[PDB]
Design a protein around this ligand. Structure first.
Ligand SMILES: C[S@@+](CC[C@H](N)C(=O)[O-])C[C@H]1O[C@@H](n2cnc3c(N)ncnc32)[C@H](O)[C@@H]1O
Lengths: 224, 262, 37, 128
């Protein structure tokens, strides 16, 4: 207030100059071909899975690859938060004919996920547990009702012909001891584990943020 | 660096509880032919914790005797045996969901899973340096525990016990915990968040599913911490409120009903 | 935000968001000067 | 029968991706993937800004926002983008100039040349 206020005016000038140039520089880098952190061979989809025409995705995948998806990872928005019925109504029966589903599940939605795998034609055969690690290397114990939750369970179901050329058996680990990188941000190691399961295959992520965009992945999301 | 003096700290703190005599009132050792086809309501009532020490016959456990999953549906858990309480099951990866489905047919909602990361005993020994009897296995477990300040340099991902499995290597054991709410206004008192949902154990490669002593004690202490009033203290407690199926024939834990398949 | 410079200078905010925060603050100082006059 | 994953990803981005997610040839538009979601400046937005400068005086941004951007735009971003287009960081002397699309490149080149001449060319902007 009073004199220092216009002093702040000089301040609100100076910063608004400097940041301006910074923004310009970034946009200039945008003009002269700046690569983003997402890979080139990533297939992003920006649509709600309630309103997304999955038949278009199926036809495009048939005419571009000749085969359905080999791994379908999923980090559902458990109760934007989709209901259990709307998550279940997703046509995963037609998105996969012979392969794996890698659906993440919080504890409160652990059982219904086993239902969904059962209701999508999959048979539940695996679980991969991500033990959250602190920066120092300790166990990132959270909050629970019966036990201190320090884990995230990704249930893996399988559907059909697996003994073909793809789908290498007896690989990776069922435990990911990785650090917490963000809010509901899954570890990167599972992707590597997926590449350990199915080398150079076609994969789908149904609820994917911009950090889940990988090579040879058809990711779906609303903030993509 | 791997903080295994803190991950495996419990192996230096928890002591195995001494087994109580069969002729003592602090245990109820019952012997049955088949636990899955035995009326357990005659061997305890008003239970709060039912820890089924189930060793399953699964394809991952190669040529090893164990319980068949399809017989678990024959088990009877009436409301007289357990009205409002928690049931603990050792779960294998190929019969996980089936167990849950079976537990849904007997009024047991899934509430938790308690997972044991397995650290390879041979891997830890090789990191220290560079059929096995259970006494020897315990000896090298204690040796690994003593020599843990020089094992901290090895990355934790090279110590995980990645055992054979058709899809993903088995470096985990699971204890699924289910609840039966039963009647209303009958509150089951629980001391919450007093045990980590994840634990780390140095195990042998041959039978990771068969949890050894000092770690079954961890499960026992988890159960006794989760259900405080289920602990049997003499004087004002008429009956035992804990009961374990397929218990050890020599270790009868006080405060529990020891059901032995004989 | 407001006169708190630390809130509008957050690293989580992007340069466009930071810059429009400074411009809104500029509008606020202009309004205060107009109220003074 | 190996699958050309570059061509496969390009074709799938052509088929089932937004016009801002991929380019005309199916290449991944990295410009969309380093700004926050909902804050991306489309080439359609650049053409809209150029048409608004042609149609309305540069400096009056409410009219441009309510006419050529359907009201869903930032006045700050409009000012910054017209500073990029004119090539000068301070557009105070360009208040309501109403410059045509086919002519604005001339003043952009003039400002850039003045930036080289006065050693004020910092990231394609005449820092006056
Ligand atoms: C559990 S988080 C997934 C986090 C992500 N897997 C990661 O590791 O960063 C749920 C995400 O799904 C997306 N999502 C939410 N509702 C959606 C919907 N209706 N359709 C599609 N995607 C949705 C949003 O991006 C939201 O953050």
């Amino acid at each position: 207030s009073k004199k220092g206020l216009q002093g702040l005016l000089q301040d609100i000038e100076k910063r608004i100059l400097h940041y301006k140039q910074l923004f310009f520089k970034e946009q200039n880098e945008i003009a002269n071909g700046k690569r983003s952190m997402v890979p080139d061979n990533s297939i992003p989809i920006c649509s709600d899975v309630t309103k997304l025409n999955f038949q278009a995705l199926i036809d495009a995948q048939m005419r571009h690859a000749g085969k359905m998806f080999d791994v379908i990872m999923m980090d559902p928005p458990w109760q934007d938060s989709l209901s259990d019925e709307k998550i279940q109504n997703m046509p995963i029966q037609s998105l996969q004919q012979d392969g794996f589903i890698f659906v993440w599940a919080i504890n409160a939605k652990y059982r219904v996920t086993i239902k969904m795998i059962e209701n999508w034609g999959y048979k539940l055969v695996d679980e991969i547990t991500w033990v959250k690690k602190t920066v120092n290397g300790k166990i990132a114990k959270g909050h629970g009702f019966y036990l201190q939750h320090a884990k995230e369970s990704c249930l893996i179901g399988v559907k059909g012909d697996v003994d073909n050329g793809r789908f290498k058996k007896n690989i990776a680990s069922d435990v990911i001891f990785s650090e917490r990188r963000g809010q509901s941000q899954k570890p990167e190691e599972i992707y590597q584990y997926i590449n350990q399961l199915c080398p150079n295959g076609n994969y789908l992520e149904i609820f994917a943020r911009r950090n889940n965009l990988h090579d040879n992945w058809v990711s779906i999301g609303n903030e993509l | 660096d791997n903080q295994l003096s803190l991950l495996l700290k419990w192996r230096n703190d928890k002591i195995p509880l001494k087994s109580a005599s069969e002729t003592d009132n602090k245990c109820k050792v019952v012997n049955v032919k088949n636990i899955f086809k035995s009326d357990l309501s005659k061997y305890g009532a008003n239970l709060q914790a039912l820890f089924i020490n189930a060793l399953w016959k699964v394809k991952s456990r190669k040529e090893k005797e164990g319980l068949n999953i399809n017989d678990l549906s024959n088990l009877k858990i009436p409301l007289s045996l357990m009205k409002n309480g928690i049931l603990f099951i050792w779960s294998e990866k190929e019969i996980l969901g089936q167990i849950v489905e079976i537990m849904e047919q007997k009024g047991f909602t899934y509430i938790e899973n308690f997972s044991i990361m397995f650290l390879g005993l041979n891997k830890c020994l090789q990191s220290i340096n560079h059929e096995k009897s259970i006494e020897q296995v315990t000896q090298e477990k204690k040796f690994v525990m003593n020599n843990l300040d020089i094992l901290k340099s090895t990355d934790i991902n090279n110590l995980f016990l990645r055992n054979n499995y058709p899809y993903f290597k088995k470096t985990r054991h699971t204890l699924l915990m289910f609840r039966r709410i039963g009647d209303k206004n009958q509150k089951l008192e629980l001391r919450h968040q007093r045990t980590s949902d994840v634990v780390f154990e140095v195990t042998d490669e041959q039978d990771p599913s068969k949890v050894d002593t000092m770690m079954k004690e961890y499960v026992y202490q988890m159960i006794e911490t989760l259900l405080p009033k289920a602990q049997f203290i003499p004087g004002v407690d008429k009956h035992l409120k804990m009961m374990e199926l397929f218990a050890s024939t020599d270790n009868y834990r006080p405060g529990w009903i020891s059901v032995i398949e004989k | 935000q407001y006169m708190t410079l630390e809130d509008i200078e957050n690293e989580k905010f992007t340069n466009l968001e930071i810059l429009t925060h400074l411009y809104n603050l500029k509008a606020e100082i202009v309004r205060r000067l107009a109220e003074q006059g | 029968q190996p699958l050309d994953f570059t061509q496969y990803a390009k074709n799938m981005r052509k088929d089932l991706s937004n016009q801002d997610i991929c380019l005309e040839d199916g290449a991944l538009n990295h410009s969309y993937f380093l700004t926050k979601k909902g804050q991306y400046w489309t080439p359609l937005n650049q053409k809209a800004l150029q048409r608004g400068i042609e149609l309305f005086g540069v400096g009056n941004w409410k009219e441009i926002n309510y006419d050529e951007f359907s009201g869903k735009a930032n006045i700050v971003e409009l000012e910054l983008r017209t500073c990029m287009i004119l090539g000068i960081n301070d557009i105070t002397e360009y208040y309501g100039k109403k410059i045509s699309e086919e002519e604005q490149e001339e003043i952009k080149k003039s400002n850039i040349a003045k930036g080289k001449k006065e050693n004020k060319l910092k990231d394609n902007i005449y820092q006056k």
